[PDB]
Amino acid sequence: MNYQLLKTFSRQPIQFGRFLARLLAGLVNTLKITRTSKSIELNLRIALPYLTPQQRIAITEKAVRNELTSYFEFLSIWGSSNSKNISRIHRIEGEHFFHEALAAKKGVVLIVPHFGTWEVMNAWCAQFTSMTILYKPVKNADADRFVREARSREQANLVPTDESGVRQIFKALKQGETTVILPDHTPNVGGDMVNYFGVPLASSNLSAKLIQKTKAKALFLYAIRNENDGFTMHIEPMDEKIYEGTADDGTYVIHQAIEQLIYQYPEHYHWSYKRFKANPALDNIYNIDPTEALKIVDRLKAEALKTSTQPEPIQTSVM
Amino acid sequence: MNYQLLKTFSRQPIQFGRFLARLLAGLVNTLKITRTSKSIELNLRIALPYLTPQQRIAITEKAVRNELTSYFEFLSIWGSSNSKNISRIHRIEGEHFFHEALAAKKGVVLIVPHFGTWEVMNAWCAQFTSMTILYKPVKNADADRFVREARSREQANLVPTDESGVRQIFKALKQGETTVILPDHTPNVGGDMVNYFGVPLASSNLSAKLIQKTKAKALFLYAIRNENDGFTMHIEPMDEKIYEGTADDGTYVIHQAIEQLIYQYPEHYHWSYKRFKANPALDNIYNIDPTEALKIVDRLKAEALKTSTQPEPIQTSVM
Ligand SMILES: CCCCCCCCCCCCO[C@@H]1O[C@H](CO)[C@@H](O[C@H]2O[C@H](CO)[C@@H](O)[C@H](O)[C@H]2O)[C@H](O)[C@H]1O
Ligand SMILES: CCCCCCCCCCCCO[C@@H]1O[C@H](CO)[C@@H](O[C@H]2O[C@H](CO)[C@@H](O)[C@H](O)[C@H]2O)[C@H](O)[C@H]1O
Ligand code: NA
Ligand code: NA
Ligand code: NA
Ligand code: NA
Ligand code: NA
Numbered sequence A, B: 001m002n003y004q005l006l007k008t009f010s011r012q013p014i015q016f017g018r019f020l021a022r023l024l025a026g027l028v029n030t031l032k033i034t035r036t037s038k039s040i041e042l043n044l045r046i047a048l049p050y051l052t053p054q055q056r057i058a059i060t061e062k063a064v065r066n067e068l069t070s071y072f073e074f075l076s077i078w079g080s081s082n083s084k085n086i087s088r089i090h091r092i093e094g095e096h097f098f099h100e101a102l103a104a105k106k107g108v109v110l111i112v113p114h115f116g117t118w119e120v121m122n123a124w125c126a127q128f129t130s131m132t133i134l135y136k137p138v139k140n141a142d143a144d145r146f147v148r149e150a151r152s153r154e155q156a157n158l159v160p161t162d163e164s165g166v167r168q169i170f171k172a173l174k175q176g177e178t179t180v181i182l183p184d185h186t187p188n189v190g191g192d193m194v195n196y197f198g199v200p201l202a203s204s205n206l207s208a209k210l211i212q213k214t215k216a217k218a219l220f221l222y223a224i225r226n227e228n229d230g231f232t233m234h235i236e237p238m239d240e241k242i243y244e245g246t247a248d249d250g251t252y253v254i255h256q257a258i259e260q261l262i263y264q265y266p267e268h269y270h271w272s273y274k275r276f277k278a279n280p281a282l283d284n285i286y287n288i289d290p291t292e293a294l295k296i297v298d299r300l301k302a303e304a305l306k307t308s309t310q311p312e313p314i315q316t317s318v319m
């Protein structure tokens, strides 16, 4: 369909192609593009060490393509009506757990890793529940309008990423409603050193804090595109251990679920994010040479296992 | 206008964003993008040695952006009606020479370097003359349809890039009509070693052959975008020396005109093309390390000047 493609490329005002070319040109001229590719490949090195160098490149290439594809699909999703987006949901596994958790009326925490095409699940979810979501305003103003408009359409209640937003989320849960937390980025402020692929990383405790206090039901969700179709969406109950222990133990149970998802579907995780920076030993690992980076990481995964048998709280010390 | 941009990005079918992402992904995954950037910078090294390293990067970056911009503008031009494209011509310098050459009824050869946004001149030119143009079918089939459709709309007579097309062009000129030759690429088959920025390069003789035999008028044409507007188009008569000597002497006069254009507007030449490969000493200069490449080129620009004082035809020998 290269032609109906060009047929609309060529139908738009000429300043549109100009604006798009300057955007691409900025990327080709900043080396932001090849910096991304090496971060993906370093991340795969760290999280999936058993890949051959041949398998890494194959997954790196599918991941580059798949993450890029998801952002375009996000645009399509955000510019589409709710019914169109709901119709994009081809199949759902585990729908039962979602309606059941709604039935319990103790709240629902949807745990969504940066994986596949998660934005497509919102319109479908929103027809069964009120949704309250953390929202960081987007730097550029028109992107923020375009996203806020799409959230307005999907009925989402946006709250600030601060304590007042957390309070509104707690309130939403206590009223039997739903929240979506993306738990797998490094928090801007704080928090807890929790192992991620064997590496202690500064991690959010928000999901566990919400769940363990309110006894809300925790569901693990992700959606993967089907070749020239819509998306299969997967709803899985979080292991009941998430309710036990400290918030950090709950966060660790969330980390295990993400790891298992990544193990099965490494090409569908969004590897561009520089997650493994979030350790005081690892602040520079994306700047330095990858093979030294990996020596530092391997150094650290070993210390952390040896220090966990030791009575001393070494890895969770934040300094 | 980032929003009305996204407003149509998001209005298209989701498989459209998918197709576009796979295209980008292919480029980021092939290193075709950073290969292009080093070819541009090597070309500027060769043709514009007086640039500081600081000035090169600035022009490299504007050239990357400007060549990319021209291809998007070509799409817009090819998908636009003739009147829309004519309206995109903001100003014309030297229109007089064009109507006068048409008046002489000995034919008109429009010499168009790969520079700026040349496709925008066609619709304007075609309202005064019949145009016959060499056409190589585009590899991909829908691109070929999209381009052939645009040429059909612009009234262009397409002829094959072989002797039969050259014959049709000669016939068109003898009937007082017009042809457009892009003279500044390396021919697929043959031809003559003519200095380009001091470097003997295998070059087309077609423009000079046409002009010197038929006594058609030769015009030098180029168009440059105006910041968020259309394009200024420039029509300049070729130096009368183009009629003198051999076809290769005529080609050299064409090369001087392109060099002067590049000197004034280096950011508007399409530097991605690997022009300086076209010498038996230079076949690998884009693969090797640029600083050795440039030693080989500097070696060659010196030999060529020393051999031109020598009675021996060294540089024009093809082996
Ligand atoms: C017009 C250009 C074409 C767009 C195609 C590629 C654009 C994507 C590149 C940006 C890369 C990551 O960019 C990141 O995107 C996410 C969504 O995933 C934005 O996220 C924003 O919307 C999402 C979804 O409601 C929320 O989770 C978040 O709170 C909010 O800030 C981030 O603000 C931005 O940092
Ligand atoms: C949908 C993708 C978006 C397109 C944006 C970028 C695409 C451009 C990248 C291609 C780079 C150079 O690509 C080159 O383009 C020229 C036009 O300049 C094509 O040229 C084709 O049309 C032109 C114009 O009628 C003729 O001069 C030529 O005889 C014909 O083959 C070449 O066949 C192709 O080799
Ligand atoms: Na692992
Ligand atoms: Na969404
Ligand atoms: Na703890
Ligand atoms: Na020069
Ligand atoms: Na044209």
Ligand code: NA
Binding pocket: B246, B248, B249
């Ligand atoms: Na000669």
